[PDB]
Amino acid sequence: KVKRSRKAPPDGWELIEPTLDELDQKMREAETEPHEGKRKVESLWPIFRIHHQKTRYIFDLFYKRKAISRELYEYCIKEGYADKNLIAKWKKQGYENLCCLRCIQTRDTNFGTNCICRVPKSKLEVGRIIECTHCGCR
Amino acid sequence: MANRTVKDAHSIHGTNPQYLVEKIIRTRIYESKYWKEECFGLTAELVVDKAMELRFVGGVYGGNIKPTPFLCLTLKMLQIQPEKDIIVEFIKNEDFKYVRMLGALYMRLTGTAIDCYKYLEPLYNDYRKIKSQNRNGEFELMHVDEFIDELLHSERVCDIILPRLQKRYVLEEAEQ
Amino acid sequence: EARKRELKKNKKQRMMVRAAVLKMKDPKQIIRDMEK
Amino acid sequence: GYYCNVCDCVVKDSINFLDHINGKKHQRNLGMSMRVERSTLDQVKKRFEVNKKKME
Amino acid sequence: MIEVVCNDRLGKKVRVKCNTDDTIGDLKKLIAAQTGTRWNKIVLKKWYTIFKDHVSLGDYEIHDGMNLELYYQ
Amino acid sequence: NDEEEYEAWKVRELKRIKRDREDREALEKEKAEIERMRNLTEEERRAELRANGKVITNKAVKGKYKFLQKYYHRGAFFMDEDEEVYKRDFSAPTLEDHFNKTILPKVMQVKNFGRSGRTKYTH
Amino acid sequence: SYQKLLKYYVLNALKHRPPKAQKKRYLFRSFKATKFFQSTKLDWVEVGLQVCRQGYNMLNLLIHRKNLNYLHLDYNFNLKPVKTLTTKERKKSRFGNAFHLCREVLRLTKLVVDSHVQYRLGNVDAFQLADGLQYIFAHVGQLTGMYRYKYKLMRQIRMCKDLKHLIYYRFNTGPVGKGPGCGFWAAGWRVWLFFMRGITPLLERWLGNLLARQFEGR
Amino acid sequence: PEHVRKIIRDHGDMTNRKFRHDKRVYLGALKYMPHAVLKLLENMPMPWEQIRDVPVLYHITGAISFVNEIPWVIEPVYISQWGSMWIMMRREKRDRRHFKRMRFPPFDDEEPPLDYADNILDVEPLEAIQLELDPEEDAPVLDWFYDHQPLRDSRKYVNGS
RNA sequence: UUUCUCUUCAGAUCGCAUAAAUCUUUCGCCUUUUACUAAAGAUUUCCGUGGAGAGGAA
RNA sequence: GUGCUCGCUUCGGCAGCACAUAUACUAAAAUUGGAACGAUACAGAGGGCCCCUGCGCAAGGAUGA
RNA sequence: CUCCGAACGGUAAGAGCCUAGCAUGUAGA
Numbered sequence A: 001k002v003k004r005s006r007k008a009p010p011d012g013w014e015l016i017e018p019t020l021d022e023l024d025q026k027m028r029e030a031e032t033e034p035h036e037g038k039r040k041v042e043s044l045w046p047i048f049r050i051h052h053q054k055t056r057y058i059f060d061l062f063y064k065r066k067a068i069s070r071e072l073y074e075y076c077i078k079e080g081y082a083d084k085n086l087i088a089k090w091k092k093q094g095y096e097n098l099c100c101l102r103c104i105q106t107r108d109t110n111f112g113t114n115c116i117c118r119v120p121k122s123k124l125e126v127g128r129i130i131e132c133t134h135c136g137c138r
Numbered sequence B: 001m002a003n004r005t006v007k008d009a010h011s012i013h014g015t016n017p018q019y020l021v022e023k024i025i026r027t028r029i030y031e032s033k034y035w036k037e038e039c040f041g042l043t044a045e046l047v048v049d050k051a052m053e054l055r056f057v058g059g060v061y062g063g064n065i066k067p068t069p070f071l072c073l074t075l076k077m078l079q080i081q082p083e084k085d086i087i088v089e090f091i092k093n094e095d096f097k098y099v100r101m102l103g104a105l106y107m108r109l110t111g112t113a114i115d116c117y118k119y120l121e122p123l124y125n126d127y128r129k130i131k132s133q134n135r136n137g138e139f140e141l142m143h144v145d146e147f148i149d150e151l152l153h154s155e156r157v158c159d160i161i162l163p164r165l166q167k168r169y170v171l172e173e174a175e176q
Numbered sequence C: 001e002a003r004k005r006e007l008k009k010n011k012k013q014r015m016m017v018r019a020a021v022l023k024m025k026d027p028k029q030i031i032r033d034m035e036k
Numbered sequence D: 001g002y003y004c005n006v007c008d009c010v011v012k013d014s015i016n017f018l019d020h021i022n023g024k025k026h027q028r029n030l031g032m033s034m035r036v037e038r039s040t041l042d043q044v045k046k047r048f049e050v051n052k053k054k055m056e
Numbered sequence E: 001m002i003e004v005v006c007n008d009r010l011g012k013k014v015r016v017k018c019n020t021d022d023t024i025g026d027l028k029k030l031i032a033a034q035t036g037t038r039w040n041k042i043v044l045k046k047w048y049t050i051f052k053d054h055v056s057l058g059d060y061e062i063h064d065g066m067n068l069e070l071y072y073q
Numbered sequence F: 001n002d003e004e005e006y007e008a009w010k011v012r013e014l015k016r017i018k019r020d021r022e023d024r025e026a027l028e029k030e031k032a033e034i035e036r037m038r039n040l041t042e043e044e045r046r047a048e049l050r051a052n053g054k055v056i057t058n059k060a061v062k063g064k065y066k067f068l069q070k071y072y073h074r075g076a077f078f079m080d081e082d083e084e085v086y087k088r089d090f091s092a093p094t095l096e097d098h099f100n101k102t103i104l105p106k107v108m109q110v111k112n113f114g115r116s117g118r119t120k121y122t123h
Numbered sequence G: 001s002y003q004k005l006l007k008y009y010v011l012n013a014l015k016h017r018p019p020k021a022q023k024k025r026y027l028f029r030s031f032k033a034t035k036f037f038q039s040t041k042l043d044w045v046e047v048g049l050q051v052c053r054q055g056y057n058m059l060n061l062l063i064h065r066k067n068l069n070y071l072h073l074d075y076n077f078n079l080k081p082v083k084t085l086t087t088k089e090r091k092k093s094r095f096g097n098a099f100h101l102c103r104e105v106l107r108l109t110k111l112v113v114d115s116h117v118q119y120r121l122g123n124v125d126a127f128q129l130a131d132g133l134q135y136i137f138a139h140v141g142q143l144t145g146m147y148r149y150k151y152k153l154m155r156q157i158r159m160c161k162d163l164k165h166l167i168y169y170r171f172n173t174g175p176v177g178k179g180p181g182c183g184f185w186a187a188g189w190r191v192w193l194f195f196m197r198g199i200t201p202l203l204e205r206w207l208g209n210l211l212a213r214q215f216e217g218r
Numbered sequence H: 001p002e003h004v005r006k007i008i009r010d011h012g013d014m015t016n017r018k019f020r021h022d023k024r025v026y027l028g029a030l031k032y033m034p035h036a037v038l039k040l041l042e043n044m045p046m047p048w049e050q051i052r053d054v055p056v057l058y059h060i061t062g063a064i065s066f067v068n069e070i071p072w073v074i075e076p077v078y079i080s081q082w083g084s085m086w087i088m089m090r091r092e093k094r095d096r097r098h099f100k101r102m103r104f105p106p107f108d109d110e111e112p113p114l115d116y117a118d119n120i121l122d123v124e125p126l127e128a129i130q131l132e133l134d135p136e137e138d139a140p141v142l143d144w145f146y147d148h149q150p151l152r153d154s155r156k157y158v159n160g161s
Numbered sequence I: 001u002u003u004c005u006c007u008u009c010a011g012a013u014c015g016c017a018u019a020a021a022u023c024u025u026u027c028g029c030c031u032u033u034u035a036c037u038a039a040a041g042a043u044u045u046c047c048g049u050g051g052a053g054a055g056g057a058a
Numbered sequence J: 001g002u003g004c005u006c007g008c009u010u011c012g013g014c015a016g017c018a019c020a021u022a023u024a025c026u027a028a029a030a031u032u033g034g035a036a037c038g039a040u041a042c043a044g045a046g047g048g049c050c051c052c053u054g055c056g057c058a059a060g061g062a063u064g065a
Numbered sequence K: 001c002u003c004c005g006a007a008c009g010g011u012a013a014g015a016g017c018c019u020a021g022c023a024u025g026u027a028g029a
């Protein structure tokens, strides 16, 4: 979502345009999507999926692939395209991949504040059913 | 009963399913002589019969708010909420006029602005006549091009307020 | 000033009396019982 | 004035009577007439037959 | 020149200064200029004595202070 | 009159098509008019050129309240229309300002048993 | 005007005692700790439109809980009747106190927000914007109908009307001599901010008193 | 980010989208803790930099989007900004003859403007009255004067975030 | 080095200005009240602010 | 899923190591029935409790033991 | 010489007929 930044972009911005705007179009489609069909909060799963995809892409470009410069790894977050605190959460060894909070224990929030996929793969998903009210991160 | 269509409705995100019209004018449509007949139920088919038998295109007249059967039938189709295929069939109908007019109107009030342009642009070539009732009861012969010009460019071409369709410049900068 | 309240109380009492008179021998009380 | 046969009532006005059978309890007892949205071909036939009968 | 009180018991006690031999369309223009509603939507009543948009003001013979129950179309 | 209808269908199509392009260029014309006024304000003339009209939508041709004629507010809700109903010079006595309000004994603001305010611009 | 401004200034200078109390009680600091709040970075016009829509939704749900199906706010927060309720209904809709005031406040707020929306949506876009804001504070002085719920407004409204001519005789001096000086809201907006900051608790109390009457009993 | 907008998708319905269960305190806190009219009366976007950020605490059901942000405009920079604006407004009042600023009621009598600017909002003229400064005398007050937060990446003129 | 959490002490124009309410007195009103007017004193509420543990990111 | 065993032993993998450990007024649903002092026809006035408007235990208006 | 106010004190009470936006989400076999 490109609105304005009161300045010019960095040098390596042209490479980001197509994939970034494809993901932004997916987000705009999921934002104006219909409510009929979403049970209670099913409409709020794919928005988290898209945000996760955007953070994944900008993080892979930041220093995982070492392609994006140091300006883009702060300017892309300086303007609104990804989350800095979320990537800081990814810096931990345990916080590999999960949503904001959909299967966490009693964190600062009464329901949870850790992650959607925070539950274990070896003991969670009681019996057989895996799901998450906030993001559905099975 | 005049609450919903049958049991459920994809709520138009603008204001509400039925309340896209002002509540005053809606309540006037209910308390009306024409609402007695044809309000027993009109889903998809009988709407076509009740539509072609009223050759007016107008809103409110009289000192009291006097709704035309044009406006009341627009509201009836609004409560019915037909599918887009029927509305597209009415939009592409050249023989009957006011059916196409109602298709355009409901598409303006029920539809994305992209589809609004896509289905209202080819209505910019009918130089034919259209009958419309002024607020003082007196009629006037108006061209259809003037009608769509007041619809898209102008606000409240009828008594209804329109839900702020975008400017063409932004869409031209972004899309078709 | 209190005369207004006194007249209002008198009018309320008279209205209650008239309502009781119309209801006691009402069509649903007297005339309805006239058929029984 | 106006008097219904199945509704078993009488309305002493015109507009007041018009707002009676359109959603009456006895009218409901006669049958549920909820507007069922017909198929897309329904409007097609409603247009074709009416153009063939009224016009033609 | 006349002062009229376009009144209502719903947060609209408006005081419009109408002309002597003026119509009511201009009076509705003033009522919208002081009330904040579209011109053609305003309605003026006094126990269902709906004043119309062509009957003049001196025709009914309104004078200073004649309040009018305001309603909307 | 089909030959006349198609002739006017272009008459309306030309005006409607002219309004579109006239609206697009107006954004540049407004910026260009500021640029023309920019150089006009810069090096046109030191108090030797106006090229203007001081145009206002509705001229409030006020008068002089007699002694305590109420401060009537026109209501600033609709003024872009430039309706002629506004140009009437609301400086007249409405209900009770017809009097002189000087022959009175000392003063009379309002005897309606509500004189919370106290002011008459003496100071 | 300057006399009234100096009067307010000196009366403010008098009632100035060192405040040291309240034990540092802060709001919007413990809400986020619970699951009844979430922080976000949303554009200002978006937040304003959201607040206006939320206020209209709240008032509409209030009027709908009362089963009054013959009233309408119209999104300018001008409560509009429908069919001349005069049998026993006009005695049922005599709010007078808080509905009137909340209506006036949300009307002012939504009006400012929609003005800036038209700015972003292709308004005059020039100094005409700030001129409009100056006229909007004049209208809050006069146009916005907040008199009935509170008559103490006239103090700050005379303050704003004096602040008006405090500027034009400092702005409309020289070439600009008659025309509408667009001015600024450096003082108007300031006064209304202080006003709302001081009067938040009154409406908190009135809603605490009213919501129990419309939701619990009497 | 966009959770708010989908949380606004419900404006009132018959248990369609969080209507029934999310109604009672959705009304209660909506009418009890307004506390946003003040913030909007205290978080003007500073029109010389009208691209404001406005962080917003929002109830989950969508009752109110409360603003937690507070303005901390630096006094002398603030006064210099509004003085430059004073000069430019005098200039625009002197030069222009016809002055259209009378759009008094917006929203068009029950036309909610929530469209095309509660969105991607392609239009963004944030260059309203930004005075063109010649970096010959106004150099040191140049790159930290048309930004509403001229302290973030300073580390010398700002104690912190 | 930078921030968020909070129990805690403020008589620094705690905030180079400035909101309201409650109570007690004194005026103007007054048809009853609520809304009121302009002066004094005190107690609270809200926009806040200052200085000191402990616990969480770069 | 992440990083690693001078692991089995390849760079295919096999086994192990440590981080991460329990959200869910569960259901997009189901059925369930009522109230205008509201329009219309009709005659056309000699002590507290239960309710409504309401911010004040300000004030105001009201049938039902 | 520009200071501009709102609510209550207000619409008799009545018997016959009629129409409706709203609300529960469960215990248990």
Ligand SMILES: O=P(O)(O)O[C@H]1[C@H](OP(=O)(O)O)[C@H](OP(=O)(O)O)[C@H](OP(=O)(O)O)[C@@H](OP(=O)(O)O)[C@H]1OP(=O)(O)O
Residues within 6 Å of the ligand: F062, G135, G138, G161, G164, G168, G172, G178, G179, G180, G181, K002
């Ligand atoms: O008509 P005047 O007695 O000369 O005073 C007017 C009047 O203000 P006041 O009536 O309160 O003194 C205008 O206010 P409004 O009538 O619009 O409410 C105001 O105009 P603005 O609203 O734009 O501020 C401004 O008039 P102007 O715009 O020409 O400056 C002002 O003083 P002047 O008319 O003497 O200039």
